[PDB]
Structure 1
């Protein structure tokens, strides 16, 4: 319709603003279908996600609304943003399709990780990660599912996070101990994940690969050592029964886990290793915080007040998580967000 034109993408019809051209599918749901596209107004490459059946049921509708509000809580260059949101329908009554537009990045971290990186690129990428994470946390959003496949980059060495919790890597490998043992978590749950990613950048191998959670825990203790009693006390009896009765591991020292041979200054190597020893800590009570990681010498070189201390436009209200509405009620809420 006038401002819109249609493109057949497989069995799906994309009806989009004429500013978006050169569409081609790069992902499919499940949750929706994604096309790479050229935005002629911004002269930039974008990703366009068409939500799959957002109004099929209350679950789909709530999820759609939640994604929209989460995106409005964030405004930071190290996090994927919502450049635009539109529907080709002209009234609430016929409102049916929701299109989300975000930045098109070049690739995820999976392959970048497997290649040799100088300390500058390593620390700068991690700095950007920590900036995005801090912004998320300030916005009342703890990711919990950070991994190479949901962190994306461009050839200019810029980095953005998406998925507030191809190639494809299962989460799990990167999930914090408190998560896999079901202990509950706080902000620094995301630091463990950063630690796993940093450790993998350093040796181009997954630190803690397990067929399942149980085997995961084993790889963790084999390398880092059995946690203290005061930690195992925080465990639910069933989990404690298993964990407390494994063979006892002293853990390998960090110089042994990440020797100099894996690094290119001998100073920078010792600093990276010190940071790793503070992130890869089983007990969240003893794990380094985001603010402290940012201030760490390995990271602080890149410090910029505007990038670290930038407050989010909104704080996510967790009350939404328990709220329920009929389909039509969710739909009106979503229509309002879209038309705004």
Structure 2
């Protein structure tokens, strides 16, 4: 398309020359912890000079050097300043201190899809389709840019003010023309080729689309157990049991998305994304009106004024420590 060609040129310019050091800590007021992760936490901040709320992600340089995840961390930031899609959380600023790595993202007050799916129980198939349509389109954009996302799950999906999805957590995202090999992602969502330690491609993302749709519509993942090892055993056999309330259409899309044989899975066939887009479970979806956000969202989060954290959890509020000494400069010089 003309747009996918435009998406390539804008991605590439930014990917070739990253925005670096576009803000600093003392321009932001610290308010509350919105989430924590492997290398830090995401905190609601308020821009002092504009008054805008942002979600500032803080990763401690020392812990990512120590857990060896420096290339993935650099990958996350470089992909984020270089992408631009309506269903992606926008990275507004980036900088580093002595101890940390900061990414301030737009505040998406509706919180994680996870909360809402657990609170509502299961989403109706229109509601699930509404969300899945956004991901299919997001994944078409990211795969065109030769980016594999690699961590689709409802915790990494935020619901905005309009009830539209905003994808976050690009910590495992990667620029891959072809196959890649890292044991990345989340157990319930890992495609059989990741589990079987193969050189996998963009189709792991499409398998994880099948885990999300089944989970959004059943209210629970297709492959669950207590041990990771037992979840894995279920995924490589890949025999899915569907809920009776699932339509025939839904069961058919999910059998083709949750196809263990990678060369037979939707999104990875010769017709590509069109086998999903043209599936009868998406027969009533106007793909451009989803993109243009002209479809009435089936759920709009109860939003107040900006800075309401109602839709996120309470975490222990720790001190944001920035050392006198500059730790891990060399490792993180491209950041």
Does the pair score TM above 0.5?
yes
In the alignment, the residues of structure 1 paired with residue 70 and residue 210 of structure 2 have an alpha-carbon distance, to the nearest angstrom, of 35
Give the conservation status (yes or no) of the 8 Å contact 2:61–2:101: no
Query: 5+ unaligned residues in a row in structure 1: which ranges?
Result: 1-14, 89-94, 225-250, 264-268, 309-326, 335-340
Matched, 1:333 2:334: yes
Equivalent residues in 2 for 1:1-340 (5 A)?
16-18=25-27, 20-21=28-29, 23-28=31-36, 30-39=38-47, 44-53=52-61, 59=68, 62-86=71-95, 97-105=100-108, 106-114=110-118, 115-164=121-170, 165=172, 171-220=186-235, 224=239, 257-259=242-244, 262-263=245-246, 269-289=247-267, 291=273, 292-299=275-282, 301-304=285-288, 307=291, 328-334=329-335
Please identify runs of 4+ aligned residues in structure 1 that moved more than 6 A: none
Q: Deviations over 1:175-234 (max 9, x none)?
A: 11111122321211111111111112222222111334442244347772xxxxxxxxxx
TM-superposition CA deviations, 1:107-149 (whole Å, max 9, x none): 2222333434333322110011112222221222212332122
Larger Rg: 1
Alignment size in residue pairs? 255
Task: Give, in angstroms, the shift of residue 173 of structure 1.
Answer: 0.9
Distance (whole Å) between structure 1 residues aligned to residue 52 and residue 209 of structure 2: 30
Q: 1:179 to 1:212 in 2, by over 3 A?
A: farther
Greater relative CO (CA pairs within 8 A, separation 6+): 2
Contact 1:37-1:48 at 8 Å conserved across structures: yes
Report the Cα distance in structure 2 between the residues aligned to 1:194 and 1:22, rounded to whole angstroms. Answer: 35
TM-score by length of 2: 0.64
TM-superposed deviation, 1:85? 1.7
**Contact 1:32–1:50 (CA<8 Å) still a contact in 2?**
yes
Identify if the C-alpha distance between structure 1 residues 65 and 194 changes in structure 2 by more than 3 Å, giving closer, same or farther. Answer: closer
Q: Is the 8 A contact 1:51 1:99 kept in 2?
A: yes
How far the C-alpha of 1:331 sits from its partner, in A, is 4.6
**Aligned alpha-carbon RMSD (Å):** 3.3
